[PDB]
UniProtKB/Swiss-Prot annotation:
GO biological process, one term: transcription initiation at mitochondrial promoter
Transit peptide, start-end: 1-18
Compartments, as annotated in UniProt: Mitochondrion
Cellular component annotations (GO), alphabetically ordered: mitochondrial matrix; mitochondrial nucleoid; mitochondrion
Effect of residue 77 to A: Inhibits rRNA (adenine-N6,N6-)-dimethyltransferase activity
Note: It has been proposed that variations in TFB1M may influence the clinical expression of aminoglycoside-induced deafness caused by the A1555G mutation in the mitochondrial 12S rRNA. However, this was later questioned as patients with the A1555G mutation had similar 12S rRNA methylation levels to controls.
Binding site for S-adenosyl-L-methionine: 29, 54, 76-77, 102-103, 132
Tissue specificity note: Ubiquitously expressed.
Quaternary structure (record): Interacts with mitochondrial RNA polymerase POLRMT. Interacts with TFAM. Bound to the maturing mtSSU until the late stages of assembly.
GO molecular function, one term: mitochondrial transcription factor activity
Name used for this protein in its record: Dimethyladenosine transferase 1, mitochondrial
RNA sequence: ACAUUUAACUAAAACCCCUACGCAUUUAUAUAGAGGAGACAAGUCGUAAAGUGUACUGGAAAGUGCACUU
């Protein structure tokens, strides 16, 4: 797959219409080797439904796409990155579903098909979650998803979904 | 534990005890499994008020609390 080039920091600064490098208020992992490492540690994703959060520039997104994922659902809150994610989607037809929304409220139990929903006592249900979010958002999210596991609802309606 | 016999008109003969050491003790090797250090990985890799210590941290790219230094 011929994916478009990864944005540089100058291109990111222009994209946020910020015109400077000091007021980013955000840190980007623009090194594809570390993102490749992270996706490797996420497990074998060949033909796996991956729900990715906090894409931003899209290093994790490109790394996941390079793995033979079946469908990749992406949720982005900043609309300014949606153009880049859209070009990335055009590069990979039918393997990227972008959604503009907030991960603390987005409802994943309806995103993927119902044929995926495996029992709790069987193996994890081929659905993986990967995320590099702001640290101010990852802890409410993990608390919320722990509550979901305790209730066996939300992303864990499919079974014992693994998170990275 | 165990015990002085014969013999002695030259002088000699005889002698023979019974008790472990083991699921004890020392060190070493082999084996399941787990954990460390080394090579700043080399590129046909990518690019352009502050500080120190300590305590909590569940909206932690660091914050707040206390004490310090310039
Ligand atoms: Mg706090």
């Amino acid at each position: 797959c011929r994916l478009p080039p990864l944005p540089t920091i100058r291109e990111i600064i222009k994209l946020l219409r910020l015109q400077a490098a000091k007021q980013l208020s955000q840190n980007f992992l623009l090194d594809l080797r570390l993102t490749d490492k992270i996706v490797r540690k996420a497990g074998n994703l060949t033909n796996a439904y991956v729900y990715e959060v906090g894409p931003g520039p899209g290093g994790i997104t490109r790394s996941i796409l390079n793995a033979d994922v079946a469908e990749l659902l992406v949720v982005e809150k900043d609309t300014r990155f949606i153009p880049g994610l859209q070009m990335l989607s055009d590069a990979a037809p039918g393997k990227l579903r972008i959604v503009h929304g907030d991960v603390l409220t987005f409802k994943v139990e309806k995103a993927f098909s119902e044929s995926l929903k495996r029992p709790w006592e069987d193996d994890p249900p081929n659905v993986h979650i990967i995320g590099n979010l702001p640290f101010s958002v990852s802890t409410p999210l993990i608390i919320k998803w722990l509550e979901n596991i305790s209730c066996r609802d939300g992303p864990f309606v499919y079974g014992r979904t693994q998170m990275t």
